[PDB]
UniProtKB/TrEMBL annotation:
This is chitinase. The keyword Signal applies. It is an enzyme of class 3 (hydrolase). It comes from Serratia marcescens. The gene is chiA. Its EC number is 3.2.1.14. GO terms for biological process: chitin catabolic process; polysaccharide catabolic process. Residues 135-536 form the GH18 domain. It comes from the Bacteria. It catalyses: Random endo-hydrolysis of N-acetyl-beta-D-glucosaminide (1->4)-beta-linkages in chitin and chitodextrins. One of its GO terms (molecular function) is endochitinase activity. Keywords: Carbohydrate metabolism, Chitin degradation, Glycosidase, Hydrolase, Polysaccharide degradation, Signal. InterPro entries: Chitinase_II/V-like_cat, Chitinase_insertion_sf, ChitinaseA_N, GH, Glyco_hydro18_cat, Glyco_hydro_18_chit_AS, Glycosyl_Hydrlase_18, Ig-like_fold. The keyword Transmembrane does not apply. Belongs to the glycosyl hydrolase 18 family. Chitinase class II subfamily.
Amino acid sequence: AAPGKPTIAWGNTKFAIVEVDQAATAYNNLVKVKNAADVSVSWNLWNGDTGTTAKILLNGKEAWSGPSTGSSGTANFKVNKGGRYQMQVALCNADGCTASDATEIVVADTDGSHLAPLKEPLLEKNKPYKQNSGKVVGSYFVEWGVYGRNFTVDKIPAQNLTHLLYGFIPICGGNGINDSLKEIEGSFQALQRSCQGREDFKVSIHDPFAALQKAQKGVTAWDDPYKGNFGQLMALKQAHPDLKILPSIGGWTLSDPFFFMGDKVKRDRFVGSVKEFLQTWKFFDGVDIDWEFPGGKGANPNLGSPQDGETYVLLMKELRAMLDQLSAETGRKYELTSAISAGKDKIDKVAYNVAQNSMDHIFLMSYDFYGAFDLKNLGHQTALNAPAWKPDTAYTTVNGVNALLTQGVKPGKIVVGTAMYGRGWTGVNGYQNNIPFTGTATGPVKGTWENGIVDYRQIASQFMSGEWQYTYDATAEAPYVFKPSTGDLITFDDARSVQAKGKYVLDKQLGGLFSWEIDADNGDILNSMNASLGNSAG
Ligand SMILES: Cc1cccn2c(=O)c3cc4c(=O)n(Cc5cccnc5)cnc4nc3nc12
């Protein structure tokens, strides 16, 4: 005498608590945060009594009920928790309940709770390591790498990292605020489009297609609410719940807005937009501030002020206070980090001994010491120590670490930078004693993607055979290759120089190692980062 068993009607099964508008280019229209997903289910009864009550069950728990008044019905209700649910329709009367077969529905949320884990095999030369050293092992993944570089989130050797940094999250602003972007074709216009209707000095997403909509492994179904980099990072967090995924704000071309944050009106708006961003995108674990640089001498020759050091310290303090409030609301731990210049000249513009009290980690950019931006003075771009031919070299890793320690920075805060790329010159000439670095160049070396820069993958693949000389400088702890016929000279990190940096980190009780940029490694560099810090293989 119980009701007939209903049949769930064919229809959409994927819903979203944070909805992405699929026909919008402005961040304010693209992202719609709701308190709950609007879910809809219909059913038909092809045999029997329709009962007197109809219920929608999610994993057995009623989400909706109403009178059963005909052979077909529809239910609209709200679901406030993300996940994949076994949904049933049940028809009930005084003599019993009859539940349909289950249909899986998706209620998407930005922690990835609706997503299958993105657990992918290691590629190229990457070998498995356990994160049991207690040291930082970090790397940058770049938003634009999914195009020409064809390097997507499913290719990250995520088990071999403690920290994954996402470069880069922009700060809204047009003329005079993001002028450095005008040097990249279409890039300034892209940010203005993303920021339409949005206040200057709030964060946004620079390339929303790459971030949210490009089909990628695990998020290829047209009705998947989140695709692109963010969708995959949510699924990666499901596979690696202890991985720290941090949005990096700034970098070389997106740092101009920081120079205006001495105005607390702008600084407050920025910090508040970061809080909203983390509440919106729950898979991120904090924020990384990559201001290049307090005091100027970044991409924009017209920016930089003596107040920048005070602004930096105030910004870190206020970001920390915001993250502590967010941590209290969610129960989660959030991290505040910053990538900083390793040059003593720039380090002494900031009181890092004060700012460290707000920060979890300082990512010391101990690379780019030399490069094709200077054709007259050549040197190791990421070396640990000075070379034998110039022991007074200003830009070395040790000089940057020592400058921080001299201010009073605790060694455990300091994460040493390694390069997964080389910088190089062409036409090097006029050098002495077989040391090409004592000469001068006529231009940049032919690069993988841009002049003067070469992926480590390509260095190991193409430039360690043939006419290329190879030398490991054991005084500086730095490899380099040189082709004398053309004068091509590339300075980079290899497994052995990374080994020296890791041993140095352990010896000086520093925080760990990090790298730029993950797509450029073939595995050798990250392998050595893990091994040198004492992570066990496996
Ligand atoms: C190709 C491209 C397209 C669009 C935007 N792009 C950027 O915004 C970039 C920024 C940086 C940058 O900031 N650095 C310094 C650095 C090192 C370590 C940590 N943080 C910062 C180095 N290379 C970069 N390449 C960039 N390329 C692009």
